[PDB]
Amino acid sequence: SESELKHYYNKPILERKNVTGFKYTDEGKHYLEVTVGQQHSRITLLGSDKDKFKDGENSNIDVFILREGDSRQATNYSIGGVTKSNSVQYIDYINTPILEIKKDDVLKDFYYISKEDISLKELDYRLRERAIKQHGLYSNGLKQGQITITMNDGTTHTIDLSQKLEKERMGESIDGTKINKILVEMK
Missing domain, CATH: 2.40.50.110 (OB fold (Dihydrolipoamide Acetyltransferase, E2P))
Known part of the structure; x- marks a missing residue:
């Protein structure tokens, strides 16, 4: 809903x-x-x-x-x-991968990584926060879509926006230093 x-x-x-x-x-x-x-x-x-x-x-x-x-x-x-x-102290962001927000119509920006080990729960939430706040997600019937996080090795982590992040995944985490780019498509 x-x-x-x-x-x-x-x-x-x-x-x-x-x-x-x-x-x-x-x-x-x-x-x-x-x-x-x-x-x-x-x-x-x-x-x-x-x-x-x-x-x-x-x-x-x-x-x-x-x-x-x-x-x-x-x-x-x-x-x-x-x-x-983090295993060491960083005074700056560790990684600033590219962030595309397509309401397909594209908007360029970056996601700021301050963590070596990041949970899907955080990414999922922080991305949708942005989508809702500035791109009308979950408003005026806009509920479908998908989040795609691409790593340096080419593997991807996909999150369907029509539903909340499945529980069993909230505990998973990914190497925040290896994240190449994040795509947020709404449709």
Whole structure:
């Protein structure tokens, strides 16, 4: 649905880097607790992201939190969006791949990478944020389309815009230094 999709991607984001999270298991479910400042949060680990991190304390990790439900409880319940912070300190962006936004009618620009390890959850969200804010995505019936992220080795990561990023993928991450270009087509 247009409004239910525009609603989801208009939700605020809690993004913090260089934090510490505690991983554990509860009933076959794997979680990662993260408490930054006063906001307490529990991240759900699925498919991929669950094995990437070890049980117990995990230091030097970055977090991209988005509350799934609409319930107004204090704690944040998010899925995926956990990556490893950069191995070194960069004072500038690491990579600035080309970003095309075709409402097919093309607009040139770049996507600014500040992370070695970036989760699909972040890209998916940040790209659609831009599409909605400035190109009327999920407004006036404009709901179809596809995101194509091309790497230096030629592999591509495709994300259908007619639906929310499938959960099992929110935990995946890609080498932010190898991203060649990003294409956002709406139709």
